[PDB]
């Protein structure tokens, strides 16, 4: 029956997956302790602007993995969000079949970073895998099923090395009148 229902929710979770709040606990318990919990380090040059790259970051993830709304206009047992800060931060990814078979991969990610928000010298080769190449932003994921990280954490090293290319060039190569 876990594998009935791991499958229907990744068949729900196509398109729409308009899920419900017994699909959220199915796919992670209210207290099971995340399976994977990692941390991604990130350039200390990249601390003066740090919510312009959250909201890259934000932007850039949402080209594989998708937002949670699943079928309820209140927040009573939506989502478990450890440190949470009205807003919320969490994704959730669904496992592709493979092979023959095995695609019964759903999981959900509340990460942030290690600390909130509250608040030039040219460029090249030196500082171009000195500055992307890969102030901490922990993880933590709900492996319900056959997640297999080995092809995950790969999937938000890039997605982070990626925003941090993007909010350079918009930050500092764009403004410069030709």
């Given at each position: 029956l876990d594998e009935a229902t791991l499958d229907v929710i990744t068949v729900m979770l196509v398109r729409n997956c308009k899920l419900t709040p017994a699909d959220v606990e199915f796919i992670q318990p209210p207290g099971s302790l995340p399976s994977e919990v990692l941390h991604l380090a990130l350039p200390t040059?990249?601390?003066?602007?740090l919510p312009a790259l959250a909201w890259y970051l934000r932007q850039n993830l949402l080209i594989f993995l998708h937002s949670p709304k699943y079928t309820?206009?209140?927040?009573?047992?939506h989502f478990q969000h450890p440190l949470p800060p009205p807003d919320l931060d969490i994704y959730l990814y669904n496992k592709p079949g493979g092979q023959g078979t095995g695609g019964k991969g759903v999981a959900c990610i509340t990460l942030a970073f290690v600390d909130e928000g509250g608040a030039p010298d040219p460029l090249r080769e030196e500082e171009f895998e000195q500055l992307t190449q890969v102030p901490r932003l922990r993880l933590d994921v709900w492996e319900k099923?056959?997640?297999?990280?080995v092809q995950l954490e790969e999937k938000l090293r890039g997605a982070a090395r990626q925003a941090l290319a993007d909010a350079i060039i918009e930050l500092q190569l764009l403004p410069a009148s030709l």
């Open positions: 040059s990249c601390r003066p602007w309820d206009s209140n927040s009573r047992n099923g056959n997640i297999s990280i």
